[model samples]
Target: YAIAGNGVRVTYDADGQTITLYRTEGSGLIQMSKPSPLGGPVIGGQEVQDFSHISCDVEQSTSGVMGSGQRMTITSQSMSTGLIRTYVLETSDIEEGVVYTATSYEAGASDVEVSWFIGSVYELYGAEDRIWSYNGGGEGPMHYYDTLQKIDLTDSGKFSRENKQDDTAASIPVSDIYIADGGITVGDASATRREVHTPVQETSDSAQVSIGWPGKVIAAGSVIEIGESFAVVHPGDYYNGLRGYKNAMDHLGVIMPAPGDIPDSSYDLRWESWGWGFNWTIDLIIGKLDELQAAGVKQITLDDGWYTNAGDWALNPEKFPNGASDALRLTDAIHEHGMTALLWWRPCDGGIDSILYQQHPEYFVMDADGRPARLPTPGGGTNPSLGYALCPMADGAIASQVDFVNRAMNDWGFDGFKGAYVWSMPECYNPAHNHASPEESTEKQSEIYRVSYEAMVANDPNVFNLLCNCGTPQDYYSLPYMTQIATADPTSVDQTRRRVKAYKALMGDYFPVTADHNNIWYPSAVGTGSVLIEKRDLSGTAKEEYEKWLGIADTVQLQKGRFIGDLYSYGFDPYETYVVAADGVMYYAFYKDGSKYSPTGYPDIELKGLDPNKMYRIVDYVNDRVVATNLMGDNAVFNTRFSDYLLVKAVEIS
Candidate 1:
């Protein structure tokens, strides 16, 4: 059969087993009924009708293939206005086969009301294979319910076995019924009772309808009625789960350590001094050390450039005329001033000029061509080429490095070592050393690091090792093993401002260890030689520069936001200093004015997570300026805020 009109054409070929309905602009395809081998009925006839410019329907008839089998007797369909109704009648034979017939009707147009319905009947082979039908309404979109209500049939003849109802009112408008047959049938009826209220401009240009079934069935007798709307059936599955950082947290173990016992006392001042380059002259550094001692600074750290190969870890005789012995004596002198001496060393690298580099050339990383690997030094002006040691994966390398570091600690009499470049060991690779793969490199690097760490702790459990070069979380989760790690090495004032905010956000739940690299100026002005100072006041230039530096250190300590310690470079005046009490509070004294300052400008300080309902005692040590007193209930909250910064001895009041 074929039909054509109004920019559309419809054709059905029984022999070809295909139906094609096409528009001058768009096309649709449908499969025609075919013979079923399982012994059902053969279809008898089919028909199609167009209800409106946007609506159409198709219907088919069926009968038993064998004359003595069940037969399809009657079928009827009607469409009026926007409503469609369809029904099928079927009969069965005692044996042989069964027959089914179907009819369909559709009405309405795009942007207008539409209605559709389908019904069917089937025969069964045995009591166990009973035939059934069902209809119901439950939770789902109203239209979804209209479609799903057709498939709820069971032997119980109820829409749902769990919920029973006798009357249609109680039985769900769509109900289920069963018959003694092996086949099943479904029926659906839907109506777009109201015309589309939206403007016609809102209508989509075109739409389609389709149906899918997993197994063979008597589809020859299937009926489709498409009106103002369409039916789409796509079969698939969906899955869901958690994602991102929260998910990572769920699988991660707690890696940070708890705070240890803190002491109870306040210092008049806490001082930190930098040691770098014999370029400033050892005499100058010694003189600065004397000045710090005279000014009562609490702590000092020897920066880079004191060892052999001063430029490449070699002691420069020109600079350190007295050698490592003098360096040790200087440390001793700093300790004599009642302060701890912290020494700095780049333990990871060995330059070509160093003894280690010469004796262990094979130990250095190699290039793909098997040449000793070298890296560019800072500034690119000169190739002060240095080679990285083969990643700890080189079996004996890690153990050897550990032994070297242990010896330095045991022999130096230093309070702690500033562990630099801890992150680099885990990040680099050299194909020449057989570290062709990054995974291999990282694994071996981590192993080597653990070895070195163990050596440091074993040599002096209390020695503070400040990890530098890497501040990422994964790199320093082992921070508790060290006394401190640099939270920020603010290289510039601009960097310092950004670091202040970064520190606040990331410092939560971590110990304080921030390093600010800003050089202090004196006379409240810039560019005065007297305004600038060195860590060791080898030059008696600026007392004011010393004052400002101490003031800033005091301020940072009072912030109490995890500022465990600091390292000042040698270019800053060394005379002005501050003290950090055993309790961790900081105090400062100006060298020029000799004025003292503690936690000021800050009030109503609150320690996060501290309880305010309990009473506490406040102990102020400066001038006994403040005394220990019980805080009242009202004051507890205030005390909670104030105690975070103020140097106070806090005890719960009974």
Candidate 2:
């Protein structure tokens, strides 16, 4: 026998002791049975959870109707052993129809004790009525506080409630109905009749309810809260008008409409010396800043290794002889070169013997059992080592840290700060403070970061803060509060290639900018390696590697500049021969004889979105030399198939 209710169809075969529940349309099948010895469902749950056996097919009988002809089937063998109920909830509506399903059930002879409540009436008198009274309240309303059979009445018509207790009644208008009130009741002096309508089941496959629940479900007898109440004449109209109501409800307290209200741009560029095997030195950084400034780079960031100690954040007195004075000088130098200077610092990180740990041994992360947290490292590893900073859940640590960073930026003249090593924030736990839940820990850490950022920004409005090592999705929402967020750190050649493609795919939408660190060796001819050599190695086929690298670099430059509007190139050794071709293509060749190295072989390349049908002129950028010339065909092509490197000017064919 097949029983249908609540957008679900259930079939029962008592002779075979098997039960199958099918979703009406565009829904998923749910099955439950005995648990296996390994602690998981044997057939249905295991296959659905482990192997993903449940299908997500949606029928396309009607255009745009989600799950149009889709059906879900669930089977269980032991229906008599335990009473089980299953539901199929509709999720998306592809067609222009109301997406809702009625709750239905099927049971065996042993499940006769089931009782169901279909429609019930509950009323409230005034605005002062306490919603928590229904759930046995104390300080606040408990869980399932608003779960009810909701029927919105604002779209149909206004409703009025009349109070008759005092002989004089006041009409409460229905337009001010509270969304969580579930349903509404209309009161008219002339009529006292009330009625409810039930939808008739149809045989045709075209008109059917999708079997699924879109909202939360609460346990029985939890809470029935009513904030506002209203009434509607036609109940069928509720389903028809749900789309508009849902849209309005979804955006109720979430949006603010204003211009220039968003925070300043949070995009930034990162410079890593370790990836390129370059030592972090003042001279090398200053020279790179000069080169970047000449190339119109706006932000020149100084990454790891600036601190005095290698494994700690303290200013290495040996490296930075004047404490923060040297850092300030570097900042001034970058600004003098006409670019913003960004400094890197990891706040929550410290080695075992670091000053912070020595000064306050208690200010560190601890395990749940009250022992100091220990992390393993390479080469046999160390115990109870302080790799992660303690959680900011402590009382005074967060504010002190904020003040420390704020003082650094204000006193040192740094334009921006790259906040790193924040990945430990989510995992950090400390017994010095109260035992914090994970959510509370995250909140505390975020609050600490916000405090730090605000403190620095208050000191300097131009202070760009880039958050790194923890690119969580939650950070995206915090963009309006930050300067930039690092999407990924490309630490290897394979990672660099992937990041390049990923950044291209995310341009103009989700991401506002992209920055990468590339390493190139310089030749010894240019001032004995003091001056940067623009030429470097080519990895592609030896015949055309140089040419291919040039073409690819040109494409990357144009796209990066257009999309991100800023570029920061790093790690070109101070001895390589660098050349910028006229077509905006950059090439690297050895300085000895200016011998070209083409990794991909083909010198000439064409770009999309440029005028293809016009003839272009080719000229040398360095000496303004007219090396070679060619005509662009109807497809907006530039002919540079020969020569080491040449620039092309797209001239009109008039």
Candidate 3:
């Protein structure tokens, strides 16, 4: 069936669910759908179709105050070819019986958001068959690609099979899906309603994505609405779909920068030591200083175990031994090596019934059970064990943390800080701490991050202020305070790129990105050894299977390139890697399984947005070789060959 209005036409699949959008006769822009019941035996698991949404899920409180959340139903949708589609979706929210969560919703004029389609969803057999929009790392750690099949999003779980739409509320796979103002847990354990990826239907032809307003509920009727549909560019083919969605994000007024693109400035090269904790002495750094300098590392991030505890955030007498004064020496050592240093600290952490807790119980958050709050970690606060979540909303909590940081800075001479693993501050369930509501708590967390982050930025003008682990931090507000944001740590190189791009599109490049320091080698040793084993994080792999999936990430995606924009349509085939960007430039690390690619695995990378009909260079950063690029369309292309998996210059060709 079809409907026409203004200058566009809307098409629907046999089921009458809004599917595709056309500018005129055959000019299709957006058209996406999923299997009828959404559960195809094989597509059920990892190869999930997150959303072919036209919409949001709302939870109206029949018991709340007079006002509840909004419930915006799709009234009607028509179109025009005159303006851009994404610009249209920017306008949008409903309902408690008495006070509705949704207030106003609009979508009749298709002139704003065009429709698009996705022919395929999952590719790799099992594990690699997933994509989702928001993931808080579930329990702990980034999602690993290359093997996530039977994973929740694919609905490998028996129950959600035929009805893939049912898997949404979990927000399973974070790489796909797009929602505006809804999530599973609203606040605390009670927020059990995550407005997951919009629903989708399966079909051999294409999945349909209806452009409708996402409905939701709230304590009060002041509804925070959500909306999205893949625009031109597309909804899938991974790269293109992500690109389209990102453009759509900017089309709306965004608040924050993403984990960000690798910036073209002083803090670009980051190096970290995860396995070497006991050796965090001045001598240890000095011993490695020459190597660090040679590796081109601009900053060294000393992760957990550095502190005596999470909250005090001072030097450990055992580790530093110099009674925290060694922090001063550590910084000097880093600077002497011509690099700066980034320290690690957790804002919400507290000592278990320790000093800070004993000092002021009110400074801590309350748990749902009315007990003081605490974030449970693998060991404890630092590693051994630790206490309460100091409430940022409390009077002196965040300020004191800032003081500790500055004081710590004074102690060690370190200029920058790395925010430790933090998912949103779970609803501070404490009213004594003074957060009015979950909404207030969530936003207050954002304010906490911004203020805390800005303090780091302000602490030193030249050093880095990178923040991490807010899988779904309020991007619009908190992102601006960061200079760089590292996505959750991905176990594999493939996961790194998937998220790098996802974060980039959803959040523009205001702050830049840092592929978490997992799949990388020291700058100097990047291209040596069995490039795969030496550079990549092979901790989870069995020695028997270590040879597969050669890797190169931080260096290519961070040191030498920073993804800029898309050049091709959605890509199929992983081995035939096809990411388009510039050098110092741009790239994608998620191009998985080169081991699976044909001899000529990579596609000829088209350099788009370049001077058309002009010459370009394909230069290898390592061997420093350059070749005249071949031009086609309005861009040019470069195809590189790997050397020792350490592609400091994969294009070291003639």
Best by TM-score: 3
Against the reference, the lDDT scores of all candidates come to 0.33, 0.33, 0.40
Query: Which stretches of candidate 1 lie above 4 Å from their native place?
Result: 1-254, 261-277, 294-296, 310-314, 319-324, 375-386, 421-438, 470-481, 497-510, 521-542, 548-654
For candidate 1, lDDT tens digit of each residue in 1-654?
A: 443322223343434322343323226422111121111111122112322222223322223221222221222222333323342222223211112223443333422222212122112112122222222221212111221112222333322221111100111112222222111211111111111110001002111111111111212233343211111110100000000111111122312333351111111233444544445555555566665755545656666656664114445576557766766776677777776666666544555577766666655555446555443221111134234544556654555567556655666566666655323232234544565454344334445445666777677665555555322211322332444434333233222222222222222223343433334322211101011123434334556556545554343333342321121100121222222222332232112221121233333322222245766555443223334366553443242233212333344567
TM-score of each: 0.42, 0.45, 0.62
lDDT of 3 at 68: 24
Report the error of model 3 at residue 14, Å.
Answer: 15
Whole-model lDDT, model 1 = 0.33
**Candidate 3's residue-wise lDDT over 1-654, tens digit each?**
433332223333434333333322235432222222211101112322322334322222222211222222222212221211111111111110010111232333231222221111221111223322222223322233231111224443321111111111111212322111110100111112222232232222222222222232222213122332323312233434434333333433433443333234333455565545555555655566575456454566666677776666667777777676677777788878777777877666766645677777777767678877555431123233435666767767787677776775665777677775654444467666566664344335555665676565566655456555433222233444566656555565444444454555445533355556455522212221111112222344532132221123334434333444344222233232334343533332223243322234445544445555444455544444553344442545555555323122222112
Q: Candidate 2 at 516: error in angstroms?
A: 1.9
Candidates 1 and 3 compared: the better one by TM-score is 3
Report the number of the highest-lDDT candidate. 3
- Clashes counted in candidate 3 amount to 80
Quality of model 3 by C-alpha lDDT: 0.40
Off by over 4 Å in 2: 1-284, 287-292, 308-314, 361-363, 374-386, 421-432, 436-449, 470-482, 485-487, 491-494, 500-512, 518-654
Worst 10 residues of 3 by lDDT: 181-190
Pick by lDDT: 2 or 3, better one: 3
